[PDB]
């Protein structure tokens, strides 16, 4: 009795049709067996094919491949197939499969097309129904069709180094916690001691006008250098609000609600961050609703911070990594950071056109990857720190704010096996997919780039 089906194909050139046809045949209720399902590495080839042809194989199937017709083992097993055809007189034993259209009638060897060949050069549906009706013509013993065990076979042979696994893995976010907040959020009631045309942003310390009061972290005598009439203001009128009440949310008065206090804290945090990192001599970029910043070329030694690339040269434009931050007080006293890259021609002035900036941002986006983003962000934040554990925010002459340099590292329960760098080239391939998917009025600025 013989019921096995074998595919003779060139590895690894024709795993495609071999896999598809074998899985379709095993889903149709016919027992299939080939190299890419069973014959893994470390198993001898030709003796197994010899015994399966002499004992087990009912119909032999050979893929007419470019390189699989020249091996010694396939010739040996086709010789023993001719021997077993001479044994019990079955000249319809082998089946020629046409997949490579480059091979004509003469390129195939002496012992294949001397019998009829199944048509496979147009599509594969008529091919496998032709295989099915040949099976029915020769009355091969078959099992009723069921795709459950076919699905199980696909699950356990095609998802080995290929599915998810259980092992620990460490991650990190772009969130940076505030170590310590101001002790007192003090509302300074200056009444008439504020000029009408006073722009609040010009103050050296963060402040926000609120009704007649002034919401600020600074002391009563911190604005002397620009307000000569703050001598006359006594130190008892201004109310003090502890920030612990704001963070805990137990502060609720008719003057300022808890959410308004939290929003004021966030606003003062953003103003303090802007002024404090403007102090650190970092160049500016004009953003619509935020403020982008970049590191001037040559300020850093070797353009590396702890041997991490931060600013570099590509083609003709200089790329500068930079961050933008907005205070967020919902999940925890943290500070979220956005990841940007800012491009200059020479390192002094900006690009006049924003489309050039965006095209350069994308082009440098594909060139490096998430890991380089991580080191760039970590180097930028560590350069933004003067000490070894925090960045030194400025809100007053005697009170400061601390934000940790290290981000909030997280961790996950499961992870995956890590393959080689070819799949990063496949990520570049899907970047080409994104290139070839959508486009909209690209020609003008593309032709303007020269």
């Amino acid at each position: 009795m013989r019921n096995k089906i074998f595919i003779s194909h060139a590895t690894p050139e024709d795993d495609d049709f071999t896999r598809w046809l074998s899985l379709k045949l095993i889903g149709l209720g016919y027992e299939v067996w080939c190299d890419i399902l069973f014959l893994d590495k470390g198993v001898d080839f030709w003796s197994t094919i010899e015994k399966e042809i002499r004992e087990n194989t009912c119909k032999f199937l050979i893929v007419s491949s470019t390189a699989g017709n020249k091996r010694e083992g396939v010739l040996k097993e086709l010789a023993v197939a001719t021997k077993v055809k001479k044994h019990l007189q079955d000249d319809m034993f082998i089946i020629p499969l046409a997949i490579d259209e480059n091979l004509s009638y003469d390129d195939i060897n002496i012992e294949i097309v001397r019998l009829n060949a199944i048509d496979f050069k147009k599509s594969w549906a008529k091919g496998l129904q032709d295989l099915l009706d040949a099976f029915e013509k020769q009355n091969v013993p078959k099992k009723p069709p069921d795709h459950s065990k076919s699905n199980l076979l696909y699950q356990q042979i095609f998802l080995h180094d290929k599915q998810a696994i259980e092992k620990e893995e460490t991650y990190d976010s772009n969130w940076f916690p505030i170590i310590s907040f101001p002790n007192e959020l003090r509302f300074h009631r200056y009444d008439w001691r504020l000029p009408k045309q006073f722009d609040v942003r010009t103050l050296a310390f963060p402040a926000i006008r609120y009704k007649e009061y002034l919401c600020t972290f600074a002391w009563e005598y911190d604005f002397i250098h620009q307000l000569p009439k703050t001598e006359t203001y006594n130190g008892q009128e201004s109310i003090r609000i502890s920030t612990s009440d704001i963070l805990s949310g137990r502060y609720d008065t008719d003057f300022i609600r808890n959410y308004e206090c939290q929003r004021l804290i966030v606003q003062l945090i953003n103003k303090a961050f802007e002024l404090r990192m403007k102090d650190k001599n970092v160049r500016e970029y004009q953003m619509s609703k935020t403020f982008a910043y970049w590191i001037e070329k040559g300020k850093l030694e070797k353009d590396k911070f702890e041997k991490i690339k931060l600013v570099g040269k590509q083609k003709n434009k200089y790329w500068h990594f930079g961050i933008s931050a907005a205070g967020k007080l919902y999940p925890s006293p943290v500070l979220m950071v956005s990841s940007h890259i800012i491009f200059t021609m020479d390192g002094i002035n900006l690009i006049k056109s924003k489309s050039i900036q965006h095209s350069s941002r994308r082009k440098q986006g594909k060139n490096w990857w998430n890991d380089k983003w991580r080191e760039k962000l970590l180097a930028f934040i560590r350069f933004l720190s003067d000490d070894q554990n925090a960045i030194y925010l400025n809100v007053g002459s005697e009170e400061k704010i601390l934000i940790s340099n290290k981000p909030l590292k997280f961790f996950g329960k499961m992870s995956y096996v890590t393959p080689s760098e070819v799949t990063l080239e496949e990520e570049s391939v899907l970047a080409d997919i994104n290139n070839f998917e959508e486009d909209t009025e690209d020609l003008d600025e593309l032709e303007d780039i020269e």
Partner: protein, 465 residues
């Protein structure tokens, strides 16, 4: 030191009661849930589109591969992958000349030429569907590049959307006839290049994406259903509350909130929300006044009763805004006592980028960060073992889920959201970041309001993509 929770990928059903975790692979192995007899498409426009479509049809009948099968899988063959009739013949072709196009190209109004050419397309296809006894399942649209460039609104020599596809599908949904728009450069990339020589539509090693997308879109517009959920509880339904803000210039916009009846199948018995004259575009509060609120809820309840023979046990509202008390009470006096309501919302403006310390592959798909019982983070885009790669760009951005009000476990709704992401149908992609209620919500709220000549939308969903 808190942890991140992982959720397994859903297993979508396939032919003969089989479940796999990939739409491309699952279509390749087993096939669709239902088998169609065969479809007879038709082209419009010029004979150049007809011959390039015939060449692409002859090419897609042949199997086409990619650089590797690890990330983009095979295409065995249209008859071998779907079991439907598809040959070179029985395709209806119609002639559209360029003399009238050349004469109306010199008109000073771009919108006038757009109106006349779109009217030519529409009355031609209605005429073809009128006097011809032969039925056409999917009409195919091919447009030249001269009209595409010399007749743009911004090119230099308001309640209707300026984009051609939206108003085409709106005025065809008013006539309840399906069609699908392809630009000439989309599939004719063999001879479509630029003046330098490099193909802008680079499709050399990556023809499998075009193959799978075109085949799956044609089969879905054919009426067949490719895949279904594996594990689903009867009695639940997915109200994807569209809240696409309408931007018809200075016309009163107000609110055109639509909804999807994604109850058990991929189709959606959508009902068009009214123009809704309550308040103005300055209604950023984005809740629902009780009258139209219970009108939409009763329409959804009647749709579920007609499509499932029973009242729904629980209804999930999927929106993009925040919710308040009064709209919930308005929903509550028309929900039966044995039913429950939970409001989930999807937003993008909250940023959080998770990074990988060691390794060359980013944060995955299926991981999640929980803040409390009502608000959490979910990672749908990023790395995935199913393709051994990452679908997203650079570092994936998550979707911030907020249970606005209502009692629901965050894990169960997390599974619901990621299966709903795993139900993308317009293209044969793995899945997408936000749930397909939100992506298709942009679609239906952007095509539905594209015309003012419609009154009641058709119940079928195949006339939308």
């Amino acid at each position: 030191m808190k942890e991140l929770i992982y959720i397994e990928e859903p297993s979508i059903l396939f032919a003969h009661g089989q479940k796999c975790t990939d739409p491309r692979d699952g279509l390749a192995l087993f096939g669709p849930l239902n088998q169609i007899y065969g479809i007879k498409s038709g082209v419009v426009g010029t004979q150049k589109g007809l011959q390039i479509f015939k060449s692409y049809l002859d090419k897609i009948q042949k199997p086409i591969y990619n650089h590797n099968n690890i990330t983009r899988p095979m295409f065995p063959g249209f008859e071998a992958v779907f079991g439907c009739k598809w040959e070179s013949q029985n395709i209806v072709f119609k002639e559209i000349t360029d003399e009238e196009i050349r004469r109306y190209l010199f008109n000073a109004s771009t919108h006038k030429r757009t109106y006349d050419l779109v009217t030519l397309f529409n009355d031609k296809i209605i005429t073809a569907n009128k006097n011809d006894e032969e039925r056409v399942d999917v009409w195919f649209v091919i447009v030249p590049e001269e009209i595409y460039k010399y007749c743009r609104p911004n090119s230099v020599l308001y309640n209707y959307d300026a984009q051609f596809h939206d108003q085409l599908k709106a005025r065809l949904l008013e006539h309840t006839i399906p069609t699908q728009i392809l630009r000439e450069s989309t599939l004719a990339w063999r001879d479509f290049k630029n003046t330098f020589g490099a193909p802008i539509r680079d499709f050399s090693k990556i023809e499998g994406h075009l193959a799978w997308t075109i085949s799956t879109a044609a089969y879905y517009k054919a009426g067949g259903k490719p895949w279904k959920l594996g594990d689903i509880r009867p009695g639940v339904c997915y109200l994807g509350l569209v809240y696409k803000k309408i931007e018809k210039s200075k016309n009163p916009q107000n609110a055109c909130c639509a909804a999807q009846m994604f109850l058990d199948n991929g189709d959606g018995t959508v009902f068009k929300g009214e123009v809704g004259p309550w308040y103005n575009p300055e209604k950023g509060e984005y809740h629902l006044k009780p009258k139209e609120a219970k009108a939409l809820l009763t329409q959804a309840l009647e749709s579920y009763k007609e499509q499932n023979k029973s009242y729904p046990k629980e209804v999930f509202i999927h929106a993009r805004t925040r919710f308040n008390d009064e709209e919930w009470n308005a929903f509550n006096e028309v929900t039966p006592k044995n039913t429950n309501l939970v409001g989930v919302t999807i937003t993008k403006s909250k940023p959080l980028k998770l990074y990988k310390t060691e390794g060359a592959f980013p944060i995955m798909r299926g991981n999640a960060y929980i803040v409390d019982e009502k608000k959490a983070f979910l990672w749908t885009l990023g790395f995935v073992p199913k393709l051994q790669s990452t679908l997203s760009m650079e570092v994936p951005n998550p979707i911030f889920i907020e249970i606005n009000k209502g009692e629901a476990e965050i894990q169960q709704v997390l599974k619901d959201i990621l299966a709903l992401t795993k139900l993308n149908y317009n293209a044969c992609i793995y899945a997408d970041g936000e749930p397909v209620t939100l992506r298709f919500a942009n679609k239906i709220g952007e095509i539905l309001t594209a015309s003012t000549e419609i009154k009641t939308p058709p119940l079928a969903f195949k006339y939308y993509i």
